[PDB]
Amino acid sequence: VNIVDYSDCFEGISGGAIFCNTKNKEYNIYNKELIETRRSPCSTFKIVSTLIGLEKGVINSKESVMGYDGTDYPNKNWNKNLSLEEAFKESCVWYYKKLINKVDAKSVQNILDDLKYGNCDISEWEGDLKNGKGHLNGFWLESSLQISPKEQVQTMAKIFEGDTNFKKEHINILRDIMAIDVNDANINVYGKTGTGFDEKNKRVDAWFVGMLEREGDTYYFAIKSDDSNKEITGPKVKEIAINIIKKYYS
Numbered sequence: 001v002n003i004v005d006y007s008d009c010f011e012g013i014s015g016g017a018i019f020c021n022t023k024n025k026e027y028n029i030y031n032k033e034l035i036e037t038r039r040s041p042c043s044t045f046k047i048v049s050t051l052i053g054l055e056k057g058v059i060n061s062k063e064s065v066m067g068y069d070g071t072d073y074p075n076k077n078w079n080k081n082l083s084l085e086e087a088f089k090e091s092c093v094w095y096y097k098k099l100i101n102k103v104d105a106k107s108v109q110n111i112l113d114d115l116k117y118g119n120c121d122i123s124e125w126e127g128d129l130k131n132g133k134g135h136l137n138g139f140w141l142e143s144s145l146q147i148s149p150k151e152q153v154q155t156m157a158k159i160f161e162g163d164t165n166f167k168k169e170h171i172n173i174l175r176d177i178m179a180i181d182v183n184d185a186n187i188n189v190y191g192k193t194g195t196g197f198d199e200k201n202k203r204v205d206a207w208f209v210g211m212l213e214r215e216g217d218t219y220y221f222a223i224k225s226d227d228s229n230k231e232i233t234g235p236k237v238k239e240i241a242i243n244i245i246k247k248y249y250s
C-alpha cells in the first residue's frame with residue numbers, strides 16, 4: 001500500500017485515485033480519505049447492471065435491444081433501438097432503466113451482496129424523485145446505493161479476475177463494450193464514466209472506473225472527483241485518469 005501524489009494530473013480539481021495490481025498486491029492510493037468514502041456510483045453502475053441483465057437473460061449479446069418505443073429525447077442517439085454496446089457507450093438511461101425494471105429486487109439485492117457492492121442499499125428503487133426527472137432515475141443515481149472508490153476497484157477485480165459466478169461469456173461482452181481508445185497500442189484501457197451532483201453537500205460525483213492491461217500486469221482503478229465546481233463531469237475525470245495512466249503506468 002503506497003500513498004502517492006497524482007495531484008499534478010488533477011490540474012487543481014479535488015479528487016483521488018486508487019490503482020490495484022492483485023498479482024503483487026500493490027495498492028497505489030492518492031487521497032486515502034476520499035478513496036475510502038462511499039458515494040453514489042451514478043452511471044458506473046452500468047458495469048454491474050449489464051452483467052445483471054445478461055445473467056437474467058434480459059439481454060444476451062452486445063447486439064441486444066430493449067424495444068425502443070419512440071419516446072422523444074434530447075440526445076439524438078437515444079432516439080433509436082440501440083444495441084447494448086451503443087447504450088453502454090451513450091450511457092442511455094432509458095435502456096438501462098427498462099433493463100433493470102425487468103429484474104426482481106431480491107435478485108438484485110443478492111447479486112450486490114455477493115459482489116460486496118458498497119452499502120448494497122436498493123431501498124430507494126425509483127431513485128431521487130425530488131429532482132423532477134421521474135422515470136429517468138434509479139437507486140444507483142444520487143440515491144440510496146453508495147460505494148467507495150476502493151470498493152469499486154475490489155468489485156472490478158472480483159469480476160474480471162473470474163472470482164464471481166457470472167458467465168465468462170458475459171464478462172467478455174462487458175470487456176468488449178468497456179474498451180477505450182487511448183491512442184497508445186501498448187496498453188489496453190477499459191472503463192466507464194459516471195456523473196452526478198450531490199445536492200446535500202453541493203459537490204459533484206464524477207467517476208472513471210475500470211482496468212488497465214500493460215504486458216502481463218493488470219491494474220484495477222477508480223478515479224473520483226468531489227469538486228464543488230459543477231463543470232467537473234465523468235468525461236473530465238476520464239481525461240485525468242488517462243493522463244495518470246500515461247504518466248505513471250506506462
Ligand SMILES: *C(=O)N1C[C@H](NOS(=O)(=O)O)CC[C@H]1C(N)=O
Nearest residue numbers: 042043091141193194195234235
Ligand atoms: C450517469 O452517470 N448518467 C447517465 C449519463 N452518462 O453520464 S456519463 O457521461 O458520466 O457517463 C448522463 C449523466 C448521468 C445521469 N444524469 O443520469
